[PDB]
Predict the structure.
Amino acid sequence: MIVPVRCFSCGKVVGDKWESYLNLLQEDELDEGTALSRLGLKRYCCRRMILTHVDLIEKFLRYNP
Amino acid sequence: NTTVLADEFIAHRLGLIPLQSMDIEQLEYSRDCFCEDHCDKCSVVLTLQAFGESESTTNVYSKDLVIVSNLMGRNIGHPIIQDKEGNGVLICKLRKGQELKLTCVA
Amino acid sequence: KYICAECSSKLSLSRTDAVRCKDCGHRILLKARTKRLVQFEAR
Amino acid sequence: AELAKQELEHMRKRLNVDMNPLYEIILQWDYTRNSEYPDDEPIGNYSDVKDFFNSPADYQKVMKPLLLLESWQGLCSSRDREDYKPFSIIVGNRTAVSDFYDVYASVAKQVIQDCGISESDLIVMAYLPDFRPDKRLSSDDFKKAQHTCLAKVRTLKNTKGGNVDVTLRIHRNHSFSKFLTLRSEIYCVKVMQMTTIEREYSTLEGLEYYDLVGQILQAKPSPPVNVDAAEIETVKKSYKLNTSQAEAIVNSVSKEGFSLIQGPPGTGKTKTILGIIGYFLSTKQKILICAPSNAAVDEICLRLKSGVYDKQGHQFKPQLVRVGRSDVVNVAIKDLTLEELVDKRIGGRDRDEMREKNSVNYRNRDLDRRNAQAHILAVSDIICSTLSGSAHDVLATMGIKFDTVIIDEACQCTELSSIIPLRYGGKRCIMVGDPNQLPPTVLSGAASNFKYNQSLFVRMEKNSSPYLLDVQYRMHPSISKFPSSEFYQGRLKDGPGMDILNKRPWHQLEPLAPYKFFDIISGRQEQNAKTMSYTNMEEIRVAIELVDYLFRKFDNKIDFTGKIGIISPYREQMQKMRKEFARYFGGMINKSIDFNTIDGFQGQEKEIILISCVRADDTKSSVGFLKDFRRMNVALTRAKTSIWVLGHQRSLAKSKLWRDLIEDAKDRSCLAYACSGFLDPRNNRAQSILRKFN
RNA sequence: GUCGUGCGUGGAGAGGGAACCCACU
Ligand SMILES: Nc1ncnc2c1ncn2[C@@H]1O[C@H](COP(=O)(O)OP(=O)(O)O)[C@@H](O)[C@H]1O
Ligand code: BEF
Ligand SMILES: [Mg+2]
Ligand SMILES: [Zn+2]
Ligand SMILES: [Zn+2]
Ligand SMILES: [Zn+2]
């Protein structure tokens, strides 16, 4: 549903940059790796945590409830 | 609570939310001090309220949390904000017909 | 005591009463969460 | 079936419009900012009002920046000119709603009553840790303070112990939210009321669903529909009108869509509206009349109270409802007020039981009042109000549809104001107004530069020629000599016997003439520090002396009840005039005399008019907004028999228009010199001053 | 550079199978 609050591997907080990540992907039309590097993600654990996440919360909210 | 998410899910997400702990040494464990009902001397109490209004689903962030307990001038328990936008850690999303009202004790 | 799936409006119906929504013909008739205090832990 | 469902959907969408974007945009503004624009965005974003709009989206895009600029300018004016009473509140729990934060605070009932805080008000909140409780608190402290946040009063709920739970909605991104700690004192002061702005924004958003959206965007009135001359002659005979007015009425009624009637003052424009209403009623249908100024609505209601004639000539009195509050509505038509009609229609354990019974009784009374109001609205055929008041929440909740809309003085309101009453499924709209009158009251010069001040009536007239009226029946021909020759360059013919019917006994006296100009030899005006409004007591004294002399000469010979009016451009000057008149004469001024402003007195009719020129000081070297020809035209077109202009010759002579007016008055020997007690033989000082000046 | 404007609420006890379709060791 929502981006994980902390990385499973290390525990770094990556949920703050999810909106920033989406903005960089859309507003700046930057590639995944460049955007993640700009956000300040060195270890690939957070890279795959952010890249591999799927926003099912938006899909769920599409329904009337 | 009437969000699409689950109470346990949102509670787990809130648990991972960082909180200021500069004065953690001053704070004492609840199991240590002889208290009742999570006295503020050993715990920090916050309240979360959120609900959309007919449109523009509301996004819940760390900044939404407001401390209700008396910290006695201690800068402990304040939400940690580091993103450039300053919104904080995304928590959940509430639809127009979804209501969220909860209390958190750290 | 009860809510409609679509209308999401309270009904507060009693025993020996129709279980159909008064506003609409839908009769899912969901029930709201209990008023009793509930606590959860991140663990 | 499907068509009815679509119509109902459109009606509910127009009535129910999301206000979140408006609050989000406005609250982001900085109260402490001192500028002519809400933000530092490029000026290129703002664009002039296009004559032709390709689609509703383009119209909304063009209008939104102008509306935001006007709202910001109004907020700044309220911050500077208006000074409310600041109060203090205690911060409570904060709720995160869509792109907003709602804060609940506890306030004292007496403080709320004194400050007049309602559920549709805007306030500015600040945190002042160093503020001294003993030290006075005013808007100056808020201006000096750098931590200011805009808030909207969502709701006001009264709790036990005389405590009101005020809900304040603010923007999340605003940093001041960090100061909103629980149990913290925050100093909040009201700024302005957003009801009109909210209604304008709702109308702008809902214009897409309006039936006449295409005509408004294209600004193309429906083509005239030919009608037999027999009907025109019959209408003229029944209503005792002229050929032009009858033709205009027939053309407007025959054709659907927008119908524009352009008639200078005194050309029966109000009488034309009454004739249209009567013809429509004779031919259930409910008609909505909207006038930008409450004075125009009051005049229309008073005229309708006398009865409406049908085609056969019989006079009938339909039920007329005035949508407004008693205070603003005139006392004469106070009976026609909707609230008055509703009032006429209806008008331990033991303590707990008594409280429950009292609550039940109050609920029953509220239900009875609502039922009476609904019955009055449904049965009523004519609904007269203002453009801002035409979107009253009660009307939206009721859902009644008005197929006929009339907009009086369409040139005095902006496009949004004129379109507000069209939200109720307006299929036929008749706009009556004269372009030479005053433009809409816009507080922003930049907005006027972008043609925001331009009214929908002006644009429609530019697109196509409205129905023109060139015959007058109110203004005295001598009084209309200069306004017609200069402002209209002719095209305005006096009535066959206007001079004969305008003869009055006081016209014989040399001091009082149908047209006369009085010069204040010694007169100065002081500008208020806060309101920045000029005011001079010399003109007030001269007017009081003139009124006293007129009453003494003709106390019982002629009654002056509702026949003497004084128009002053400045609100402060008008208030001072009214106060001094009440002090001198007493209660008679409440009825025998009226006081108003040129813009607020537009459309009014009075036998005797006194036009006060506040700018009586030559050292100023500026005439102000009076320099515009529309202001002078409106001021001069109020008098029916007698017009008396008070001012300083030297100060006014600087401007070309006033110089020409003074020259014309001198040519007709209407110039006069006035001062303190110039009509008192005992006061030889005034006579000596007059002799020296001559 | 000062102009309009919207609203009146007190102890106690206690019975269900046969078949079909999948999956794991
Ligand atoms: N055919 C007519 N015969 C006599 N009087 C008329 C006729 N038509 C109009 N009038 C007079 O002209 C006046 C028109 O006033 P009006 O132009 O409506 O004022 P305003 O321009 O301020 O609205 C009315 O008071 C009415 O008495
Ligand atoms: F044209 Be009038 F002055 F209303
Ligand atoms: Mg008129
Ligand atoms: Zn990681
Ligand atoms: Zn404790
Ligand atoms: Zn239902």
In short: The beta strands of chain B are 19-21, 45-51, 58-60, 66-67, 76-79, 92-94, 99-105. The helical segments of chain B are 7-15. The pocket of beryllium trifluoride ion (ligand 2) is lined by residues D 264-265, 269, 409, 434, 437, 602-603, 637 (CB under 6 Å). Chain B has one helix and seven strands.
